[PDB]
């Protein structure tokens, strides 16, 4: 469960609206804002004494999230496990 979310947009900067979809420990968050994204966006997590368990550390996807137009919250979207998605606009 390393892949957590996606960024969609055009310029992908603070000039225009962009769509950010991120899963966290208990929910899924969808936001649309004039985000100022990090040079290399990611989520920070740390691990327990045993490698089997982990906890939320910091959120490092963007430096700012101004002029938001949309927000939605629900439950997480997420042998080996195969997950498939289709994204349309």
């Amino acid at each position, epitope marked *: 469960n390393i892949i957590r979310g996606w960024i969609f947009g*055009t*310029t992908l*900067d603070s*000039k225009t609206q962009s769509l950010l979809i991120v899963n966290n420990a208990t929910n899924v968050v969808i936001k649309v804002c004039e985000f100022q994204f990090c040079n290399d966006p990611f989520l920070g997590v740390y691990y327990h004494k045993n490698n089997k368990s982990w906890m939320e550390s910091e959120f490092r996807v963007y430096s700012s999230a101004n002029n938001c137009t949309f927000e939605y919250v629900s439950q997480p979207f997420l042998f080996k496990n195969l997950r498939e998605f289709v994204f349309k606009n």
Partner: antibody
Amino acid sequence: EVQLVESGGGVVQPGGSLRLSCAASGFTFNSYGMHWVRQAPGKGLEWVAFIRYDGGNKYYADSVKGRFTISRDNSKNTLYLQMKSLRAEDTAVYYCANLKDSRYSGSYYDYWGQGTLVTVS
Amino acid sequence: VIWMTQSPSSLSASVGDRVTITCQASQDIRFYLNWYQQKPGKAPKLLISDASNMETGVPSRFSGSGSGTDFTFTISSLQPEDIATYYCQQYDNLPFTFGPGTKVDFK
């Protein structure tokens, strides 16, 4: 790493025809749209045509519209330009490129080929 | 068709000098403008996209700005390696167009 190689250039007469091609490698060619841009010696850049990643839609400049056709082959990773009814004014170095474009091409990178010289005389 | 113009057509400057190039669009193209650099015998290289977005690998001495119809390109401290012709491209609407270009020479 990322390569774009134009070929098929040569010397032809007015009223004739010539077909150019551009080989692509090192990247997911079939994921990107492509542009043709030409430049005469000592002159600035002239945009020629654009084709979508799927080879669906095609766009042309008025200077070539009705005479030139843009096409591509995603199985051989090759871009083509079919030129008919050539004129002296078509003398230029023809480039294939993946132009960075936040609105249309969707590319986050910008690549240009070596260019191939076409002469009409 | 959106037409692009540039000013000056050419300029000369010494090492350490500040160099500016002005571009203008016949139509409002928002910030959808690319700045290309070209030297003889070589293909154009992209230095700036979306008006002011600096490309990775481009030296900090380069910058861009402007919006709407009026755009600018600046070199804060000209080097011997910065002698080239710069072009503006608009990509707001197809067909795309390039400007006439501005040449920077060595003083």
